Amino acid sequence: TQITGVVLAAGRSNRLGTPKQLLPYRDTTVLGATLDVARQAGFDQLILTLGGAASAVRAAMALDGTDVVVVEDVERAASLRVALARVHPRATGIVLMLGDQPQVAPATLRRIIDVGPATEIMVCRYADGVGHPFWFSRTVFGELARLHGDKGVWKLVHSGRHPVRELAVDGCVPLDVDTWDDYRRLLESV
Structure with missing residues (x-):
C-alpha cells in the first residue's frame, strides 16, 4: 500500500x-x-505544511516521520501545491486534513482511506453539513496545484465539474480554531 495524508497547518493566528x-x-x-x-x-x-509559525512549531514539537513543508505568506493554496510535490508516485491520491481539527476520529480516517480511492473526490457528510477529511484522487492533483486566492479547496469540493462523493459520518462538522471563542468551545468538548 501507499496511503498519503496531508495535514495543513499553515494558517496565521492573528x-x-x-x-x-x-x-x-x-x-x-x-x-x-x-x-x-x-x-x-x-x-x-x-x-x-507550515507557514509563518513554522519556526515556533519546529522548535516546540517532535516532527519525526512527517515530511514537513514550509511556505511563505500568500495571504490566502501554495501550501497544498508544495505539499503535492512531496507525494509518493505510488500514492493514488491524498487524504486532506486541517491542523486545527483534532476532533476527527481515527475510524473516520480509516473509512475514507478504505473507500476514498474509488472516488475522484470525497468529502464527509456530517449532520450539519460537509467537512474534512477530504479525499482527492491523483487525477485532480493538477487542478489542486492551480488553486489561487478565493478559488480554493472548499470551492472545488462544491463544484459540479467533478463527481464529488460523500462519506456519511456521525456527529458534527469539526470545529475550526481561529478565534479564542473557537478554542474555548474546543476545550468544552468531551
Missing part, C-alpha cells in the same frame, strides 16, 4: 496572538493531537 498549532490540548498541543490521530489511521506517508 486573531489569537499565539500559534494555534501550539495551543494546549489534552496533554499535547492542538496540532499534536491532530498528528496523533493521523498516525493511528495507517498512512504510509504524512505531509505537514
Whole structure:
C-alpha cells in the first residue's frame, strides 16, 4: 500500500496572538493531537505544511516521520501545491486534513482511506453539513496545484465539474480554531 495524508497547518493566528498549532490540548498541543490521530489511521506517508509559525512549531514539537513543508505568506493554496510535490508516485491520491481539527476520529480516517480511492473526490457528510477529511484522487492533483486566492479547496469540493462523493459520518462538522471563542468551545468538548 501507499496511503498519503496531508495535514495543513499553515494558517496565521492573528486573531489569537499565539500559534494555534501550539495551543494546549489534552496533554499535547492542538496540532499534536491532530498528528496523533493521523498516525493511528495507517498512512504510509504524512505531509505537514507550515507557514509563518513554522519556526515556533519546529522548535516546540517532535516532527519525526512527517515530511514537513514550509511556505511563505500568500495571504490566502501554495501550501497544498508544495505539499503535492512531496507525494509518493505510488500514492493514488491524498487524504486532506486541517491542523486545527483534532476532533476527527481515527475510524473516520480509516473509512475514507478504505473507500476514498474509488472516488475522484470525497468529502464527509456530517449532520450539519460537509467537512474534512477530504479525499482527492491523483487525477485532480493538477487542478489542486492551480488553486489561487478565493478559488480554493472548499470551492472545488462544491463544484459540479467533478463527481464529488460523500462519506456519511456521525456527529458534527469539526470545529475550526481561529478565534479564542473557537478554542474555548474546543476545550468544552468531551
